[PDB]
Every structure is written in structure tokens, then in C-alpha cells.
Design a protein around this ligand. Structure first.
Ligand SMILES: c1ccc2c(Nc3cc(C4CCC4)[nH]n3)nc(Nc3ccc4nc[nH]c4c3)nc2c1
Length: 274
């Protein structure tokens, strides 16, 4: 029936989410039932890798407290089980929101990107790269429910199981992330750095604007080959897109990470102001 983790409880009937490496249930605080949580647990179908990823996510999330990072309230790590008690975001993920809305207005995109940028400032200052940014890993919190403004929505980054520290004079080479949101250097099995995350942000923004990822293929292999053959990548951006947002997209969606927008440029882009 009811299972308990510290001061929190959940039942496995309340399944929120399922992946290869985690299973997520809705739960609540045992003493304040109105305080909702999401409890992330091992997926026993991939026991070893799931246990490893959840352990790593605990390590990273312990260091990252921010309004736009889904919060770790508590956790419980044992030899044969791992639980993470997470902030509950009632609005679901950005991918589903985009399906419902079809596209977002530039004003909404600005509101969401300002918030993503604030969380990315904290990762950058800590020397952490996320490596799995995609709309499914952006959660929305809508505390005001049906009576909420656009400004009311809070956006929060989730899933730090693939994140790592990267020393400023080093490069990463681990192949991870989701093919359609992976920087070209990542999917081509090359060395990469924090600018890979900036490509993924660019793809997320493009998808908000158009409803589609910017470069599509019938398979990851085919996407790799496409990136390998095309030295210049220009996403197809709708003609009515404002010039500042267009400039931002083109700077983020640079094939070559040397040419790509860097963090200081992203953080201070005028689109994020007005
Ligand atoms: C309706 C209402 C709420 C949700 C929801 N809420 C969550 C999820 C979490 C934290 C557990 C890790 C994030 N806090 N709040 N999540 C989901 N799906 C999901 C659940 C785990 C996820 N991990 C990465 N992306 C995920 C996407 N659907 C929903 C549909």
C-alpha cells in the first residue's frame, strides 16, 4: 500500500513517469498532505545503470539549489535501493505543453528562456554541464492553475543523471544526451564542452517557435551523417520571427562550437531583456 521515505509517502499506483533508468511516483509529505512530491526510484529492469545514475543525480542536485532547477527535498540511498524526493511540478513537461499549444508566442519564449538562462548561470558558475537538455527535461510549475498568467508559469530543469563537472581546461567525450537535441560535436563522437548545452537550448527554443526540432532524420545514424556531410547548418526559421530572436537562434545553432554563441553572450542577449 503506502510506502514511506523519510517524512514523505507515496503509493506505486500513482505512476507519473517511466524511463529506462527511473520510475517516478506522485507522493506527499506525511504531515502536510497538500505538499506534493515526485519520488524517483530505481528501474529494476536496468538495475545497475539506474542505481548509478540516481546516485550521481543526488550528488549533483545536492549542490544546485535554484528556483528554476527542480528541487531535491530529500533522498535515501542504500545498498540496494535509491529514492529521490523531488519538488512536484503540476504543469508537466515542456514537450507536452508544446504539443497542446502547438507553438509559443515570442513573449512566452522570452519568459521561459530568461528562466532557463538563470538556472544555466548557476550550472556555468559551478562548472557543471547538463548534457541531456530537451523539452522532456523542462518541467512547468503552474501554482495558480486555471487562473494563472503567462508570467505565472515557472520553468525548471530536470534530470541531472548525465551531468558532470568539467574543468575549464578540459573537454568531455562521453556520448550521452538525446540525438535530436545533441550538439553536432557530441553526436559525431568528438570532444566537447559547455557549448554543447547551448546548442541543445537552441534546439529547444526553435521547437518552441515552430513546433518541430530544427534538424530531423529518420534515425540517429542518419542525423549524424547529415551533420557530417553538411559543414554549414542553417535552420529554417519562420519569416515573421523577430530579428533579435532569429539572431539568437542562428548564434546558438552554429554547427561548429568554435563559432557558436558562448555563455556570456547568451546571458546578455537583448532578446532576454526585451
Ligand atoms: C502531469 C503533471 C506533472 C508531471 C510531472 N511532474 C514532476 C516530475 C518531477 C521530478 C521527478 C523528476 C522531475 N517533479 N514534478 N512529471 C511528468 N513527467 C516527467 C517525470 C519525470 C521526469 N524526469 C525528467 N523529465 C521528466 C518528466 N509528467 C507530469 C504530468
Amino acid at each position: 500500500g503506502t510506502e514511506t521515505v523519510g517524512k514523505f509517502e507515496f503509493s506505486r499506483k500513482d505512476l507519473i513517469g517511466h524511463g529506462a533508468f527511473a520510475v517516478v511516483f506522485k507522493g506527499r509529505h506525511r504531515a502536510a498532505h497538500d505538499l506534493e512530491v515526485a519520488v524517483k526510484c530505481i528501474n529494476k529492469k536496468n538495475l545497475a545503470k539506474s542505481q548509478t545514475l540516481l546516485g550521481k543525480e543526488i550528488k549533483i542536485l545536492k549542490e544546485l539549489k535554484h528556483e528554476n532547477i527542480v528541487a531535491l527535498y530529500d533522498f535515501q540511498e542504500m545498498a540496494n535501493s535509491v529514492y529521490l524526493v523531488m519538488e512536484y511540478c503540476n504543469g508537466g513537461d515542456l514537450a507536452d505543453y508544446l504539443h497542446a499549444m502547438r507553438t509559443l508566442s515570442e513573449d512566452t519564449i522570452r519568459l521561459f528562456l530568461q528562466q532557463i538562462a538563470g538556472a544555466m548561470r548557476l550550472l556555468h558558475s559551478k562548472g557543471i554541464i547538463h548534457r541531456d537538455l530537451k523539452p522532456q527535461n523542462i518541467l512547468l510549475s503552474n501554482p495558480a492553475g486555471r487562473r494563472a498568467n503567462p508570467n505565472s508559469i515557472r520553468v525548471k530543469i530536470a534530470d541531472f543523471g548525465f551531468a558532470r563537472y568539467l574543468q575549464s581546461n578540459m573537454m568531455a567525450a562521453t556520448l550521452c544526451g538525446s540525438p535530436m537535441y545533441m550538439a553536432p560535436e557530441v553526436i559525431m563522437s568528438q570532444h566537447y564542452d559547455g557549448k554543447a548545452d547551448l546548442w541543445s537550448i537552441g534546439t529547444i527554443v526553435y521547437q518552441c517557435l515552430t513546433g518541430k526540432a530544427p534538424f530531423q532524420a529518420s534515425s540517429p545514424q542518419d542525423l549524424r551523417l547529415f551533420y557530417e556531410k553538411n559543414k554549414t547548418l542553417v535552420p529554417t526559421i519562420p519569416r515573421e520571427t523577430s530579428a533579435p530572436l532569429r539572431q539568437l537562434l542562428l548564434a546558438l545553432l552554429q554547427r561548429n562550437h568554435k563559432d557558436r554563441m558562448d555563455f556570456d553572450e547568451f546571458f546578455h542577449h537583448p532578446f532576454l531583456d526585451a
